[PDB]
């Protein structure tokens, strides 16, 4: 709540919003899913991986 | 029998010394390993090509 929203006449750089009604914005929620990507069937030879 | 005096008794000697070598290199092999997969982790192991089998 504190970076997402710039007052009007503020730097905007790193938030979301900007407006005359920034400082009564606020999050409800904010939800994050992360999906990892990777090769599998890691090969063995006579040395090993 | 008409052998001579020569070189066929080195020649004995040769052959038995032959054969001698073929037995021992015949059972010279370490009873081990050498078949290979020394990757003790290797329970799915393919190396090929799909569709594979193990008796006709």
Same mark, same amino acid.
Request: charged letters at 10%.
């Given at each position: 709540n504190n970076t997402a929203f710039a007052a009007?006449? &503020?730097?905007?750089?790193? &938030?979301?919003y900007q407006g005359a009604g920034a400082a009564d914005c606020e999050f409800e929620e904010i939800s994050y899913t992360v999906y990892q990507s990777y090769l599998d069937q890691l090969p063995v030879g006579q040395n090993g991986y | 029998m008409d052998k001579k005096k020569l070189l066929y008794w080195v020649g004995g000697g040769l052959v038995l010394i032959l054969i001698w070598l073929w037995f021992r290199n015949r059972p010279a092999a370490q009873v081990a390993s050498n078949w290979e997969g020394p990757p003790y982790m290797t329970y799915n192991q393919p190396q090929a090509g799909s569709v594979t089998l193990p008796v006709a």
């Open positions: 009007v006449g &503020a730097n905007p750089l790193e &938030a979301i | -």
